[PDB]
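Internal QA ticket QA-208
Title: Verify multi-chain structure generation after dependency bump
Assignee: T.L.

Test input:
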Amino acid sequence: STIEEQAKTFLDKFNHEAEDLFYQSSLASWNYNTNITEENVQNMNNAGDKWSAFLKEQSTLAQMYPLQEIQNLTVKLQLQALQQNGSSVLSEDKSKRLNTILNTMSTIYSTGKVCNPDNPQECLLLEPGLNEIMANSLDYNERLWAWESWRSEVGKQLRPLYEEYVVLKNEMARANHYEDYGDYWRGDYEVNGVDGYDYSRGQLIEDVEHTFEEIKPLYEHLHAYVRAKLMNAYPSYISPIGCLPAHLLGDMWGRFWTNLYSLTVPFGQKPNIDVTDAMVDQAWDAQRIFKEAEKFFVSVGLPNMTQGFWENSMLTDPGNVQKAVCHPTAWDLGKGDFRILMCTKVTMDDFLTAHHEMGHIQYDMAYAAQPFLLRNGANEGFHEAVGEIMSLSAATPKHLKSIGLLSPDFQEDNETEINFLLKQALTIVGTLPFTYMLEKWRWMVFKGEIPKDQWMKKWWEMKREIVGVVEPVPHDETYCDPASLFHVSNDYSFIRYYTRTLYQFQFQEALCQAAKHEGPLHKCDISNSTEAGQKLFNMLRLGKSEPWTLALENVVGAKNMNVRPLLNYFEPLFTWLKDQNKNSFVGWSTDWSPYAD
Amino acid sequence: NYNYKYRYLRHGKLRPFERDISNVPFSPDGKPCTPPALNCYWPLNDYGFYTTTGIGYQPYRVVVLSFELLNAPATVCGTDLIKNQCVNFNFN
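Actual output:
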């Protein structure tokens, strides 16, 4: 009949053929990342190559239809996904060269190890070993050695690959009618044809800088506080007015700073909200942790998973006989087959991670009615946000107080209140200028605002100015520690965690409005209050058929990111920070350096 | 087990008890095709049963117990013995 109906007919042919193929592809990926065998690595991408040729095949077969003749937004947004030309639109030499550069970076970022300069037998890779030395070790030389050697073995090899990668990938993104590959990120946030809920691409840089300008004083006070407590931790190693060295920040770069909390604790003589030891001492296994998380998901109004989850998922690490990756990943294999792969230990971090990935699967089960490429987030930034909602609500003292942990005659006084505030605040506050700086850096490098012979120089100057982080030993352009970062070398964005961090507390204040919580946000447990889970479900199931501005306005009432709810979560803690930073310098200085002192 | 296929392309609904067997190349206004022609694909596809999947994607066998009413004498219709009591009958 009309072109709209045969667009629907052909697109339904596409999804109904695509579903079994994507199901076999995701099964290939599951049976690879649950038992690493050579049959699994060969058959993993074979059902992936079968799928990737199918998609560019049907992309070529769908573009012949008229894009600007379809009235329905719902199937024109289907056409926007299939008429996305992808990364195969180049010269066939440079497309495979870009794919091989990405794979070479992915190999040498993960296979790389550090070695003792006098002993070529003590060699250590990233996870474990270096994520354990960089977090809780107290030796200055050992943290600096692991820190610098992780940059000195692989980042020197990762620099020419990223050097070619930026030009090849921005050539692809310009071929796809974008400014750069950062603009390719922002084009996912772009929505078209909705008349009021739409999105321009420069708004992301605009609005990230908008909220960042008021993260700057909050982050400034908390950075001054954790600088003073690292002065309590590391004598004669950190200047009080200056920045912080990146080998003392808990992680390899400066992204997560929650590991500082054990040495940046406010009140060292109060019972900690972290109930990991209470989870071990009350004798839980992996199954009881996931059942308790499922109990909270029932408490907020959300159902259980499919039977395939509790039937087939790897809820426990099998060990040496069956090796498996131990990243907690929410697997969405298609055909309603929903799993979580996690080498589960008995930890409140693992309990909140059970909440996190079960919230990811909950997001998936909400969009289970959507068609195929619509079965994703509205943006890339609400998937991790919805995952983090149940972890933020399931970390409160009221929550763990009546879980069975954290004895229920516990005082909600301001001491342990500001303790739990500052524990979550090291995370939330340390992740924002690193994400701002990293995405601004990649927008600079992908657009071309940093010249390619000054990546590492402007990198650490942005760490010193924006993040307030010095490098302890100097860095020429032989390195590329951004290419020695995880989310950069493997062709991914990172601004979804920035948007996550804002819209998280937005959604949390909106759900605690639904929960009818009265004080500040941290005491709010949304368990037994189905209004919060229902208000989450008001946005949880629409997906990409409507814009993420619409799903954001359904819950918190806006079309844009905002610095207010995070600051309202930190505001009594901000009064506490003002109470604490009177005896330290408020700020950071880019002229300090632990190699130039 | 993809071997139970569903017919999903036909012009219009099925009639009372219509048993559609004929497999024709389908285009949404007739127009005799042969695949892989444009808007010319099959009216049949595979279910996609694996036991690993969700509950509604598991294979269920359905009998329809179809009623047609009294077009011939009684075909299917449907009281233990009592002893030493004044009972009523209807034997064979």
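Spot checks passed. Chain A has 22 helices and six strands.
Status: verified.
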